[PDB]
Design a protein around this nucleic acid. Structure first.
Ligand code: KLQ
Ligand code: KLQ
Ligand code: MG
Ligand code: MG
Ligand code: MG
Ligand code: MG
Ligand code: ZN
Ligand code: ZN
Ligand code: ZN
Ligand code: ZN
Lengths: 47, 65, 249, 224, 249, 224, 65, 47
DNA sequence: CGGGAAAATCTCTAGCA
DNA sequence: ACTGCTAGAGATTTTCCCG
DNA sequence: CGGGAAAATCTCTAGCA
DNA sequence: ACTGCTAGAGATTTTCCCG
C-alpha cells in the first residue's frame, strides 16, 4: 500500500493522498477520490 | 547458410538507453531483434534492451571498413 | 526519547520544520524525524527528481502545432531519426490535421503518432484518419509537454532555421519548406553523423532488413534450452525466451 | 587481406560487383571497388517525374520516383507556377531529389519553378508517369466513395499505392523499394567520399589503412 | 580542396548548413568547415553553455519584490547564509523600499545590496537611503534574473512556506512573518547543518573574529619573502603578497 | 587526553570555565564541561524587553536585547494589540526570542499578543528599557532634521545605536555584541545537545568517543 | 603569543567554489583571510580563493571535538 | 580582437558583431554601434 | 615511448510556450 | 495503464602521427 | 576482515515569473 | 566593468559497529 501526492494540471497546489494503482518508469497511475489520474513521476511523490 | 545471416544481423549497430540514464549509450552489436526486446552486446556485456529504448542503424560509414 | 517524538509532532503541527531541524532540536534519529515529516500532508510538495524517456520506436512519430507570424505550422517528427515534416495550415482544426496526418502516413510508414491533448489531435476527424491509415493514437499527460519533448524541441529548431531563411522567401510556407529541407538534408550530426533524411532512411531500411533476417534465422534454428527457445548462442552466454542464461537441444 | 587476389580472380571469371566481393570476402568497399575498377570488361536514384492530371475538375500534381515507383500526389487549387514550385520544394525537402522530368508545361517552365529548383539544387530536364497516373486514377476511383473531398481520396490512393500494393521481383511495396534504393544511394555517396578522401595520399595509390597494414595499388597490382 | 571551400561557401550562403554537413559533403577538414560557419553572422545563435556565480560575500544582500494574493512582498536574503527578511508593503514604490532597506541596514551589517532593475530599487529614494546607511548598490543585468538567483530562489521557498501556514493566519502579513520565522529558525540544512539564523550568526561572528585575529597576526609577523610580504608560512609552501611560492626574512 | 587531569587541577585551583579549559588544553567541550561540573565550588541571551514610547504624537515600539543593548524600534500607527503582536512576530522571526518583558500595558496583555507569543514559542513575563528609550529619543532628536517622516528618523536612530555607537568593555557596538552573544548561545545549545545525546550510553558515564579511545567518567574519576 | 592565534584562525572552516564548478567544495582549513582573497588548505592543497567565492564559518558542531 | 554576438533584452533575435571590451567570468562588456552593453556569457558568443 | 595535434567524447544550456 | 529533447559551444579525454 | 545498517555525499528537478 | 540558486527526493558511495 502506498500514498501518492501529486500535481494535476497547471495547478501549483499539491493534492493527495491517492492510492497507487500502477508505477511505470516516468509516470504513475493513481486513484484519488474515485477518479483515476495519470501523473508523471516528476509531479508525484510516493510514500 | 544461416551463419552468414547471423553475421549480417550482427553487423548492425544499436544506440540504446537505460531506464534512468538520459544519455545514449554507444553502438552496441545487435545479436537478436524481437518485437518487444532487442539483445545487444556492449563492452562484452549481453543486454536485453526494450524495443522502445533502441535505435538500430547500419551506420553507412561502414564503407570504410 | 519518545517524549521528544511527541514534542516534535506538536511542533511540526505548527512550524512544519523539516526532518533535520526536528532531529537536531529534539534529539531524534533521522528515521523518526523523516517519518514525522512524511506523515504530514502539507509537507509533500516536491516530486521525484528524475525524467522519463519518450518512446523512440522506428514507427512512432510526434506531432505538434506551433505558431509563427500569426500562422499555424503543423509539424511532425520521426522520434527515432529527427526527420521532420512541417506544413503551414490555414487553421488549427482537426479536419486539417487529419489531412496532414493521412498525407504523412501515405509518405512514410507511420505506425504510431504521439501528440498532446490539443483539440486538433483529440478530434473525431483525426481519430477516423488514424483508424483508416492503421495508425495508433497516443496522447501525453495533459499539460505535460515533456512527454512530447522531441517534437517540441524540433519546434525550436524549426523556428530557428526559419529565422535564418525568412528573407530568402516571400511567404511563410515557402520558408517553412526551406527549413524542412535544411533540417532534413543540410544539418548533419547525431547517432551516425547523418542528416535527418539519411538517418530515417537508415532506420527504416535497417528495420526491414533486420526483420527479414531474423524471420529467416528463427525459421532455421530450432533448439530448446524449462523448455525455452534459443534466441542467440554465444561463447559465454545463451539467450532464451528474455534472460541471458544450459542444455541446448 | 588474404581474399584480395582471390576476389580479383572471381571478378576475372565471374565479374561480381564490388558490393558482392566486399561482404563475401570481408574486404573494405574501397578495395573491392578498386578491384572492379581495375578490369577492362567492367569499364538514377534521384530522378523524379512530375505531371498534372485532371480529375473531377481538380488538378493533381503527381511525382513518381522513376527508380522505385514511389508516388507522391497533391491536389492543388490551380495549375500555376507558384503551386508547382511549392510542391517541388516540399518534395525536395522530403526526399533527396536531384533531377525532375516534366512535360514542358506552362507551369513547369515558369520562373518560380526555376527559382525553386535552383534553390533546392534540382536539375530540371524537359512513360512511367503515364502508367502511374493511370494506376493512381484507378485507385482513386476505387476509394473515392470513402472520402468526402477529392484531396483526402488522393491521399488515400497514394497510401494504398505506396504501402498496400506489393509486386515486382521480390514482392515489396513502393515504400520499401524507395527506402532501399535511397539506402544504396547513401552507401554509394559515402563510398565516393571515402574514395575521394584518400586519392590525395601517395604511399602507389592508397586504398585502405587498417591497424598497421596499409593496402596499396602499386603498378596496378594491389599489394597489402 | 580549396575549390570545395568555395562550393561550401556558396552553399552555406543558401542553406546555412552546420560544419559537419559541409565537412561531409565537400570533403573539408573540420577546421575549414567550422571557420566557414563561424564567418556567417546568421549562424551565431547560441551562447556559452555555462553559468556565472553570484557574489556571496558576508556583507552582500539580495532584494526582490514578489507578489502574492494581489499584495507586494519585499524580500531580502543574506546571500552567504540564506537569512531572509520579508515584509508586505502597501505599494511597490521606492519610498517603501527605502524604508525597508534602511530598517534592514539598521538591524544587520548590510554592506552591499544586489537588486534587479525594478523601478522600486532604481529610484532616487533608495539611492539616498543607501548613501546614508553606507550601502553599495549593485544592479544585475537588465532582464537577467539569474543574477539574483539567490533571492529569486528564496522567493519560491518563501511562497512555499506561506502555503503551509496560510490558514494559521488571518492576514497575509502575519503569514509572511510566520514564513520568515519558519525559514530562519525551523528549517535546518546547508553548509553547517544550521538554520538560516544560526548560519547568519556564525557567518558574521566569524567575519568579526577572523578580521580581529588577522589584524593581530599581521601586526606581529614582519617577514619579507622581490621583497613580498609573508602571509602564511607552511611546511611545504609559503604564501606571499597572492601566490603560493624562498628567502624569508 | 594528557591534559584532562591537568585541567582538573587548574579548575581545582583557578576554577576556569569549560570554554577556557577546552581551547587551552585541546579538550573536547564535553570533557571540560564534566570537569567543571564535577566540582563543588562551581555548583539570558533570549530575554527581550518591550515598551511603547510616545514621540511627536506617534507611538514607537522599542525592543531591547537586555544582554547586549541591541535595540529594535518601529513606529506603529496605533497602540493596539494587533500591531504589538505583529511587531513581536517580526522580531521573533528575525532573532531567537525566548522571553519578553513588558510593563503590563493594555496592548501587551491582549489575547492577540498572547496568541503570537504562543505560536512563536515566547514566554511572556510581566530598568534597561527606560535608559535605552532615553538614549533612542536623544538619537532621534539628533537626527530628526535629516528625515521627513518620523519612521525613517527612528530607523536612522536604530542604525546609529546598533552600529555607530561603540562603548562597553572592549569598544564594540550593540550589533557585534548581540551577534557574539547569540553565537555563544548557539555553542551552548549545541553542547547541551551533545551532552544529552551521550547520557543514554553506559560504558561509567560516556563523555567522548574519539578514534578508538573512549573518554569515561568512572567513580566520578575521568578515565580515558 | 601568536602561534595560538594562528591555530585559532586555522580552526575556521571555509566552503569555497571554483570559477566554473557550480558545487560548493568541502570545509577547507582557513590559513589567511584578506580583504579580497582567502588562503585555504583543502586536501593538502593550498588555494587562493576570491573573497566573493567563500563562506567562512566556525561550524558550531565543533562542540563534539 | 574579438567578435561578440549577443542577446540583449527579452528579444529573441541575436545581434552582432560587437567589440569585446571586457571579459569576466559570468558576463562580458561589449561595444555595439557606439553603445556599450553588458551581457551575460550565456547570452553571448565570442569568436 | 614522448609529446602535439586533432578528433571524439563529455558537460551544460535555451527554447520548445 | 507512461515517460524531455536537441543541437551547439567549450572543455577534456583519446587517438593518431611521426620520429 | 565481512557484511549490514546508517549516515554522508552525489544527482537532478521545479519555481522563482 | 559581472555572474543561478535552493531545498528536497532518491540513489550511491563511505563509515561505523559488532563479532
Ligand atoms: O509549454 C509548452 N511548450 C514549452 C515547453 C515544452 F515544449 C517542453 C517542456 F518540457 C516545457 C515547456 F515549457 C506547450 C504548452 N501547451 C501546448 C504545446 O504544444 C506546448 O508546446 C498545447 O498544444 N496545448 C494544447 C493541449 C491542451 C491545451 C492545448 O493546452 C496545451 C498547452
Ligand atoms: O523571471 C523572473 N523570475 C523567474 C526566474 C527567476 F527568478 C530566475 C531565473 F533564472 C529565471 C526565471 F524565469 C523575474 C522577471 N522580472 C523581475 C523579477 O523580480 C523576476 O523574478 C523584475 O522585477 N523586473 C523588473 C526589473 C525590470 C522589469 C521590472 O522587468 C523585470 C522582470
Ligand atoms: Mg501542442
Ligand atoms: Mg508544443
Ligand atoms: Mg524583481
Ligand atoms: Mg524576481
Ligand atoms: Zn508538516
Ligand atoms: Zn571485370
Ligand atoms: Zn550561415
Ligand atoms: Zn570548581
Amino acid at each position: 500500500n502506498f500514498r501518492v501526492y501529486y500535481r494535476d494540471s497547471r495547478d501549483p497546489v499539491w493534492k493527495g493522498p491517492a492510492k497507487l494503482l500502477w508505477k511505470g518508469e516516468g509516470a504513475v497511475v493513481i486513484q484519488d477520490n474515485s477518479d483515476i489520474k495519470v501523473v508523471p513521476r516528476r509531479k508525484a511523490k510516493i510514500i | 547458410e544461416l551463419q552468414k545471416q547471423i553475421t549480417k544481423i550482427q553487423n548492425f549497430r544499436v544506440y540504446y538507453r537505460d531506464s534512468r540514464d538520459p544519455v545514449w549509450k554507444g553502438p552496441a552489436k545487435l545479436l537478436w531483434k524481437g518485437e518487444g526486446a532487442v539483445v545487444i552486446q556492449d563492452n562484452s556485456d549481453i543486454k536485453v534492451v526494450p524495443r522502445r529504448k533502441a535505435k538500430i542503424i547500419r551506420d553507412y560509414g561502414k564503407q570504410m571498413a | 526519547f519518545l517524549d521528544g517524538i511527541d514534542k516534535a509532532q506538536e511542533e511540526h503541527e505548527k512550524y512544519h520544520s523539516n526532518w533535520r531541524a526536528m532531529a537536531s532540536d529534539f534529539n531524534l534519529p533521522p528515521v523518526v524525524a523523516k517519518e514525522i515529516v512524511a506523515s504530514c500532508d502539507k509537507c509533500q510538495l516536491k516530486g521525484e527528481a528524475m525524467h522519463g524517456q519518450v518512446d523512440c520506436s522506428p514507427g512512432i512519430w510526434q506531432l505538434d502545432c506551433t505558431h509563427l507570424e500569426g500562422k499555424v505550422i503543423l509539424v511532425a517528427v520521426h522520434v527515432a531519426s529527427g526527420y521532420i515534416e512541417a506544413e503551414v495550415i490555414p487553421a488549427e482544426t482537426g479536419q486539417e490535421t487529419a489531412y496532414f496526418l493521412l498525407k504523412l502516413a501515405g509518405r512514410w510508414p507511420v505506425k504510431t503518432v504521439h501528440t498532446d491533448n490539443g483539440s486538433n489531435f483529440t478530434s473525431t476527424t483525426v481519430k477516423a484518419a488514424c483508424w483508416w491509415a492503421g495508425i495508433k493514437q497516443e496522447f501525453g499527460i495533459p499539460y505535460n509537454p515533456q512527454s512530447q519533448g522531441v517534437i517540441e524541441s524540433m519546434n525550436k529548431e524549426l523556428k530557428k532555421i526559419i529565422g535564418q531563411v525568412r528573407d530568402q522567401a516571400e511567404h511563410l510556407k515557402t520558408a517553412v519548406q526551406m527549413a524542412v529541407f535544411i533540417h532534413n538534408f543540410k544539418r548533419k550530426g547525431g547517432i551516425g553523423g547523418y542528416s535527418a533524411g539519411e538517418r530515417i532512411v537508415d532506420i527504416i531500411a535497417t528495420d526491414i532488413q533486420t526483420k527479414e533476417l531474423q524471420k529467416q534465422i528463427t525459421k532455421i534454428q530450432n533448439f530448446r534450452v524449462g523448455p525455452a527457445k534459443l534466441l542467440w548462442k554465444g561463447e559465454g552466454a545463451v539467450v532464451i525466451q528474455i534472460k541471458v542464461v544450459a542444455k541446448i537441444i
